[PDB]
Amino acid sequence: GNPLVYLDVDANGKPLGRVVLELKADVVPKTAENFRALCTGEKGFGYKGSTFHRVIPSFMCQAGDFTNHNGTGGKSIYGSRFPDENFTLKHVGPGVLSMANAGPNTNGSQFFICTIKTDWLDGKHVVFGHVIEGMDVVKKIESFGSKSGRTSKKIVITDCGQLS
Numbered sequence: 001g002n003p004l005v006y007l008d009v010d011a012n013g014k015p016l017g018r019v020v021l022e023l024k025a026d027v028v029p030k031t032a033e034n035f036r037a038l039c040t041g042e043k044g045f046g047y048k049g050s051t052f053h054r055v056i057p058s059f060m061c062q063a064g065d066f067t068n069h070n071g072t073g074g075k076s077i078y079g080s081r082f083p084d085e086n087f088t089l090k091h092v093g094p095g096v097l098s099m100a101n102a103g104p105n106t107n108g109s110q111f112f113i114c115t116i117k118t119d120w121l122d123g124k125h126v127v128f129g130h131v132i133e134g135m136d137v138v139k140k141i142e143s144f145g146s147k148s149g150r151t152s153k154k155i156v157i158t159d160c161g162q163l164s
């Protein structure tokens with residue numbers, strides 16, 4: 001079935017717990033596969049050790065820039081960027097997992113977990129999964145954001161991988 005992956009997240013070096021994400025490979029297989037492999041690190045790079053560098057309360061928590069750790073970087077398992085696979089899944093509410101981008105067809109590795117419905121991102125960001133477990137962790141992460149996105153704690157994906 002669809003991959004289940006996990007992010008174990010620290011804030012200021014103490015574990016918040018685990019976010020478990022279902023990757024909707026049945027809808028966006030290429031996008032799901034990218035994220036899955038970045039979680040396992042099996043291509044030799046990925047999210048382990050990277051940060052939630054942009055967190056906006058009542059919006060989303062964004063992570064995945066494992067190259068520059070600041071929102072300018074990241075890369076996919078396919079190359080630096082890959083196309084928007086489709087926009088079929090919508091930003092329906094908290095827990096939606098969606099690809100950050102810098103315009104059309106600029107998916108890399110950065111992603112965000114919504115903490116609200118973000119319908120204006122429909123058709124602009126490829127949704128590719130959702131939180132199965134650990135919304136409490138997401139809410140913790142969110143609580144360390146700010147309007148500017150700057151985090152008030154260092155939020156680190158200390159471990160990540162695939163559960164199934």
Ligand SMILES: Cc1c(C(=O)Nc2ccc(N)cc2)cnc2cc(=O)[nH]n12
Nearest residue numbers: 054071072100101102106107108110149
């Ligand atoms: C809009 C934005 C991004 C972003 O989405 N960047 C981006 C996404 C995907 C790819 N492939 C390359 C760059 C990352 N960090 C921050 C901080 C901030 O205040 N805004 N912001």
